[PDB]
Amino acid sequence: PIETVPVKLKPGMDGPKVKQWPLTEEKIKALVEICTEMEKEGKISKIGPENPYNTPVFAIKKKDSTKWRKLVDFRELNKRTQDFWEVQLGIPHPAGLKKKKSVTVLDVGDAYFSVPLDEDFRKYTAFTIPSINNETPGIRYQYNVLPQGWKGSPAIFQSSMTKILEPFKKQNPDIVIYQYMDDLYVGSDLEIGQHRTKIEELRQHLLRWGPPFLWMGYELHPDKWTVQPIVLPEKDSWTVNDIQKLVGKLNWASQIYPGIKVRQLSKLLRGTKALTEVIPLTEEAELELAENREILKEPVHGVYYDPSKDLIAEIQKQGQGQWTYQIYQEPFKNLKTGKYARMRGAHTNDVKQLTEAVQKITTESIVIWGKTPKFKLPIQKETWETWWTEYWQATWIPEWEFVNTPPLVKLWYQ
Amino acid sequence: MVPISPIETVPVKLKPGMDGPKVKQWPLTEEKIKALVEICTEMEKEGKISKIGPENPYNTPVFAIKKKDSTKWRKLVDFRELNKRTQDFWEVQLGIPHPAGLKKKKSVTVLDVGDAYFSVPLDEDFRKYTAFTIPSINNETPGIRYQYNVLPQGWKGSPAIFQSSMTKILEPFAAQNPDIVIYQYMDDLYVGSDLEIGQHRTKIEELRQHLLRWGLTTPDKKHQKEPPFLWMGYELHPDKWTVQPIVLPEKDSWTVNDIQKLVGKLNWASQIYPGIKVRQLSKLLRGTKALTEVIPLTEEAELELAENREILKEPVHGVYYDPSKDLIAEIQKQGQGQWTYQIYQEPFKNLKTGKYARMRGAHTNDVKQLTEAVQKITTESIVIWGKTPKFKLPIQKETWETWWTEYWQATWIPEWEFVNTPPLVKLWYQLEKEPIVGAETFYVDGAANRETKLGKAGYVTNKGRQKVVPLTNTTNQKTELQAIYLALQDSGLEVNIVTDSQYALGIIQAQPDKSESELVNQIIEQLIKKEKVYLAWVPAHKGIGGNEQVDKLVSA
Ligand SMILES: Cc1cc(C#N)cc(C)c1Oc1nc(NC2CCN(Cc3ccc(C(N)=O)cc3)CC2)ncc1-c1ccncc1
Numbered sequence: 001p002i003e004t005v006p007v008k009l010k011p012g013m014d015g016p017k018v019k020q021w022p023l024t025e026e027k028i029k030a031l032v033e034i035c036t037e038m039e040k041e042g043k044i045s046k047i048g049p050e051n052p053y054n055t056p057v058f059a060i061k062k063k064d065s066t067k068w069r070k071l072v073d074f075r076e077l078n079k080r081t082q083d084f085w086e087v088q089l090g091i092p093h094p095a096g097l098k099k100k101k102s103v104t105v106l107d108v109g110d111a112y113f114s115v116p117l118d119e120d121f122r123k124y125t126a127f128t129i130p131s132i133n134n135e136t137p138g139i140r141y142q143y144n145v146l147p148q149g150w151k152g153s154p155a156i157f158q159s160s161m162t163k164i165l166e167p168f169k170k171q172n173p174d175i176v177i178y179q180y181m182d183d184l185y186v187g188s189d190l191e192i193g194q195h196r197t198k199i200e201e202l203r204q205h206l207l208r209w210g211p212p213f214l215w216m217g218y219e220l221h222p223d224k225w226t227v228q229p230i231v232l233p234e235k236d237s238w239t240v241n242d243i244q245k246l247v248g249k250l251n252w253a254s255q256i257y258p259g260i261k262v263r264q265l266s267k268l269l270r271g272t273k274a275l276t277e278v279i280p281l282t283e284e285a286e287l288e289l290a291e292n293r294e295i296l297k298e299p300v301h302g303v304y305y306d307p308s309k310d311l312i313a314e315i316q317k318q319g320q321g322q323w324t325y326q327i328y329q330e331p332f333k334n335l336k337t338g339k340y341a342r343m344r345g346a347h348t349n350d351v352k353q354l355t356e357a358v359q360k361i362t363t364e365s366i367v368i369w370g371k372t373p374k375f376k377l378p379i380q381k382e383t384w385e386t387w388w389t390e391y392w393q394a395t396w397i398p399e400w401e402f403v404n405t406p407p408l409v410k411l412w413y414q
Numbered sequence: 415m416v417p418i419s420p421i422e423t424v425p426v427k428l429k430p431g432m433d434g435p436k437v438k439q440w441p442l443t444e445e446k447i448k449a450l451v452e453i454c455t456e457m458e459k460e461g462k463i464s465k466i467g468p469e470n471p472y473n474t475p476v477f478a479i480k481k482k483d484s485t486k487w488r489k490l491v492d493f494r495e496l497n498k499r500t501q502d503f504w505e506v507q508l509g510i511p512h513p514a515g516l517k518k519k520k521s522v523t524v525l526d527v528g529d530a531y532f533s534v535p536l537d538e539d540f541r542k543y544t545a546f547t548i549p550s551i552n553n554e555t556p557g558i559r560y561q562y563n564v565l566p567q568g569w570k571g572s573p574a575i576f577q578s579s580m581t582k583i584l585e586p587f588a589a590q591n592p593d594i595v596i597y598q599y600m601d602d603l604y605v606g607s608d609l610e611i612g613q614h615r616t617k618i619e620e621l622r623q624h625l626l627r628w629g630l631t632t633p634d635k636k637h638q639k640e641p642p643f644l645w646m647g648y649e650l651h652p653d654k655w656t657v658q659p660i661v662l663p664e665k666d667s668w669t670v671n672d673i674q675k676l677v678g679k680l681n682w683a684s685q686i687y688p689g690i691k692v693r694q695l696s697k698l699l700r701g702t703k704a705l706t707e708v709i710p711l712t713e714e715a716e717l718e719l720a721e722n723r724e725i726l727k728e729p730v731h732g733v734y735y736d737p738s739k740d741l742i743a744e745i746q747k748q749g750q751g752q753w754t755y756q757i758y759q760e761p762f763k764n765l766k767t768g769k770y771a772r773m774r775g776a777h778t779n780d781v782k783q784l785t786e787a788v789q790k791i792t793t794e795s796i797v798i799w800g801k802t803p804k805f806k807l808p809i810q811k812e813t814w815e816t817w818w819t820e821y822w823q824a825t826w827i828p829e830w831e832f833v834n835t836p837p838l839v840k841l842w843y844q845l846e847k848e849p850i851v852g853a854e855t856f857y858v859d860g861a862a863n864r865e866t867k868l869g870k871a872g873y874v875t876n877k878g879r880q881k882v883v884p885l886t887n888t889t890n891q892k893t894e895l896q897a898i899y900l901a902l903q904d905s906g907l908e909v910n911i912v913t914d915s916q917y918a919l920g921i922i923q924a925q926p927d928k929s930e931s932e933l934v935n936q937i938i939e940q941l942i943k944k945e946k947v948y949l950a951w952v953p954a955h956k957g958i959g960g961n962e963q964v965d966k967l968v969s970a
């Protein structure tokens with residue numbers, strides 16, 4: 001690769017001017033060592049004060065690894081980089097990736113460092129290694145090659161990636177391969193035994209066709225990904241409180257499902273009764289409950305993925321290490337719901353658990369639709385922004401907003 | 415002649431679309447013109463400026479200004495127009511160091527780099543934009559035209575380009591001398607080390623020998639100011655640091671700007687003076703922008719101000735950082751949403767102190783404010799020391815565990831230990847997760863007419879107890895809260911409450927312990943008095959008995 005691709009920002013937009021956030025000493029030291037090596041290899045170069053742009057940088061440790069990885073937060077630059085088409089009008093998302101028995105994720109971002117970047121665009125990738133206590137000037141760099149995390153890197157490299165994968169794609173027509181940013185998602189239907197070595201067959205390919213983190217594989221099983229429909233209790237004796245919670249849940253579900261009825265169940269709540277008093281169900285209420293239970297078994301109707309609109313992901317903390325979540329584009333039309341439990345290594349850290357939930361939900365969103373959702377997080381902004389980088393292990397970063405008012409809805413996914 | 419290396423030129427451009435300045439030269443007196451000609455003549459011999467022909471179409475006005483005792487003239491090129499059209503730069507001098515993060519240095523030398531400032535060449539393709547004109551005597555010859563060859567004083571890019579050029583020159587010297595520290599701001603160069611005073615200086619001339627590679631003369635700074643160094647408003651002493659002496663003025667009439675300068679003194683003081691409070695003072699500056707407006711001080715601002723003077727009686731000093739020791743932060747609650755903290759490595763020797771004020775809002779509680787103070791101190795400590803301190807907090811471990819395991823939001827506090835320093839942060843009430851057996855059940859409701867603002871609130875219970883109260887000048891949301899308040903007032907120590915108010919649930923489920931709404935505060939006071947409260951929600955207008963009965967009792 002010797003001839004670059006012309007790239008521009010979007011009309012009427014300057015480069016990013018995003019403040020670098022504070023870094024611990026151990027992350028500064030790791031970034032200094034990493035960037036010293038990248039500079040010797042020519043991937044980045046020092047810049048002068050005539051470059052006013054900046055993009056934040058930090059360092060992570062990937063899952064089951066011991067060496068630091070540089071992570072640039074290109075979220076603002078990506079928003080300002082022109083939309084890509086170039087080679088074709090766009091590759092459609094493989095709807096079959098989500099139905100494979102096993103999907104392995106590979107970090108192929110190091111391959112991007114072999115393609116030079118447009119010399120006119122390089123100034124927009126500027127970043128700063130800060131110093132502790134501002135005692136020295138921050139070390140300023142810009143990229144000479146396609147950077148990991150930039151929207152333009154997989155698009156520009158797509159032609160080269162296709163030619164490297166072609167001998168393997170010809171051999172195996174049943175293996176789905178999807179690329180998202182620095183990640184390669186390789187889905188098969190054969191068993192785990194030498195699915196690993198067939199994935200190892202991928203590694204020697206890129207190795208001979210061209211890495212610090214190539215050796216690792218993030219293994220998923222989307223065929224065994226469970227959904228969470230709406231479930232009504234099954235009881236032999238219903239208290240006033242039980243029926244009251246049931247009517248509230250059914251009233252909420254009526255906004256989602258047509259024909260939900262509570263009038264017969266509301267008739268049992270006739271009078272001013274103690275909350276713990278047992279109420280025998282009438283058969284008209286028993287019948288109404290049965291019809292609602294049947295309605296809630298069929299899927300919601302009029303629910304389609306619109307690739308022009310954003311995906312929204314809402315998350316609720318349910319306690320005891322359990323988290324529920326819903327993905328949608330319009331309210332009350334969920335495209336996906338789910339629930340997690342036992343976030344490893346975080347039994348006494350809420351924020352670490354939430355951070356892992358965000359990464360898992362984003363991974364699922366990439367597999368199903370090929371993009372990341374915008375999160376509504378049940379956490380105060382100042383708590384999240386202080387800590388999330390300490391537990392981040394992915395090479396992409398989604399967008400998020402914060403929920404400050406407790407939703408009444410947590411009870412009805414409980 | 416010893417060959418000197420050229421200082422690498424920074425390429426500069428104007429903002430896109432913009433052109434260079436074209437400002438007309440002001441009329442000058444014959445006296446000022448003679449002054450400007452002699453000065454610019456000297457500057458041309460030094461290489462700073464150069465005469466240009468008439469084809470350069472840009473111009474910036476020049477002036478001549480007189481001083482106080484020095485009966486001299488000095489020029490002033492007014493680059494305000496050029497600065498507007500100059501590109502933005504990376505300013506490497508946003509955040510200054512904090513003294514509490516600095517380490518002790520046995521020896522410190524201060525050298526002047528003023529003469530070196532003019533060895534920094536200006537980008538050649540940009541010089542044409544710096545053109546200025548000396549008008550001629552009696553306007554009878556063409557004005558003499560000049561442009562700069564070096565960074566002009568008052569030009570936008572001069573501080574950034576000068577600092578960057580010095581850093582690039584100094585980088586190999588610091589990297590191969592890890593025993594010293596080099597810090598530059600403005601035209602002073604500070605060099606510190608833990609080398610003894612003889613060996614120290616040898617490195618100093620070693621730095622001079624390195625700096626002469628680019629032909630930079632660097633003598634010691636005129637009138638070595640003996641300690642403490644007055645830097646960015648601090649007082650840097652060999653073993654300690656402090657704020658420059660603060661004096662709170664004595665006044666009988668306090669206006670807007672006096673109180674605005676008073677928060678700045680107290681805020682600046684709060685970094686080392688423990689226990690400073692500024693709320694009841696900062697509260698008097700709510701919505702006014704007339705800096706001459708006089709405002710009477712509350713009796714609480716006098717109490718707060720008099721408390722500040724007592725803290726400011728004797729100067730306080732902080733220690734410098736020792737990486738071998740641990741880093742500890744201790745927080746105290748001060749009241750009215752105010753918090754103070756101290757950061758130290760050994761007891762009673764603070765590295766620094768500070769304060770935290772709660773954010774604006776209708777409802778709040780102490781645990782959330784404590785969490786916010788922790789995150790602010792954490793972020794500040796990362797900046798100053800590159801690490802999180804260990805926390806000493808006035809909250810019991812059991813209190814925190816109950817809070818975060820039950821709170822609807824994710825929350826986290828880093829490694830910390832309880833310190834028994836009243837007033838302790840507590841949970842003042844805890845709602846039940848399940849209905850209480852044997853407790854009376856209150857179905858509450860309220861409603862108001864938006865036309866007349868007349869409303870009713872009340873309850874009915876499973877024992878037949880009932881109340882409806884008529885209300886004036888109220889809203890739907892206030893009557894829903896009043897109904898809950900009535901149920902709490904008239905019930906025993908354990909009570910089940912059923913409401914249809916999503917607004918009231920949203921407030922109570924936020925677990926406030928204090929509010930600006932007097933009605934919410936009354937509800938909190940009742941909840942503190944109870945043994946057990948179960949609060950249940952039901953949808954309105956849905957045939958739910960008790961709720962239907964009380965809804966039309968209140969709906970007039
Ligand atoms: C931020 C900063 C401001 C000034 C000023 N003006 C000066 C310096 C050198 C400086 O930079 C650093 N200053 C420190 N220490 C400080 C300097 C030393 N005093 C004590 C002292 C001792 C003996 C004397 C004496 N002999 O009279 C007088 C005073 C303590 C503060 N340490 C590290 C750095 C640093 C710089 C660059 N990169 C990394 C670190």
Ligand SMILES: [Mg+2]
Nearest residue numbers: 859861954965
């Ligand atoms: Mg009502």
